[PDB]
Amino acid sequence: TLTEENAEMQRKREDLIKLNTEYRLKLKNLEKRLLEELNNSELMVTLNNLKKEAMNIEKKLSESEEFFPQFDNLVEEYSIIGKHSVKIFSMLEKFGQFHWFYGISIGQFLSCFKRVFIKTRVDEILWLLYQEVYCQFSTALDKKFKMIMAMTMFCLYKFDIESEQYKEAVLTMIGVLSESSDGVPKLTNDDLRYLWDYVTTKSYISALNWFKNEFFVDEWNIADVVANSENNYFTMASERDVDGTFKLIELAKASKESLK
């Protein structure tokens, strides 16, 4: 992200590659020129000009050393995104344990983290990361697991961005929805009052999908996944009492491809 989003260590990487190459090549060239000087103890003017270029470049690169604290500051500025990604990868790896068919590989996460920007800067890139990982991983989870993952992404965002009272409100609303904690939630807009009225009126899925649509605003069906895809291999799964061939028939009819 520091070589691609801000290009920070992009130009710092080309600069440090040039600096290390300068170190090695100029040490070798200084050894060769000192050997020539020992052999010599037109040519004099060239040697003096090369020496002057060498000391000017070395002086400039030594004065460039003071930018390294700025580089380290800019590197450690983007670390909250790292902790968030560690949380996201841990949640991917642990949803590989509730079921035997929801595994995760590191390469897929690397691919999606490149594709988030292949196509409040920290807040914007964090929002992009959450949105893209949800978009790319909603298609491998069924309705229950997809809804759970969406709720976890929304709660993680609203707890690592917003304050503590909203966090406590979300926790107690979840606890009331789980029929575990018998405590009236504290509201901070009309949406929370509407949710309280709905759970008073024994309506759940309406307000749950209301919160889900409040978090994410873009949907991704199987056609969208197969359209914006890189690999040529796709695996489809379902449950036994549900077929899925007719959807592929409709997709092939729409996309004008010979399905066999």
Binding site: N48, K51, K52, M55
Partner: peptide, 24 residues
């Protein structure tokens, strides 16, 4: 024209101490 070479040799003999310290 030898002043630059003399200064380079002097600088090498100067930072020899830091070379020893950041060698050990």
């Amino acid at each position: 024209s030898l002043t630059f070479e003399k200064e380079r040799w002097l600088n090498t003999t100067k930072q020899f101490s830091k070379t020893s310290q950041e060698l050990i």
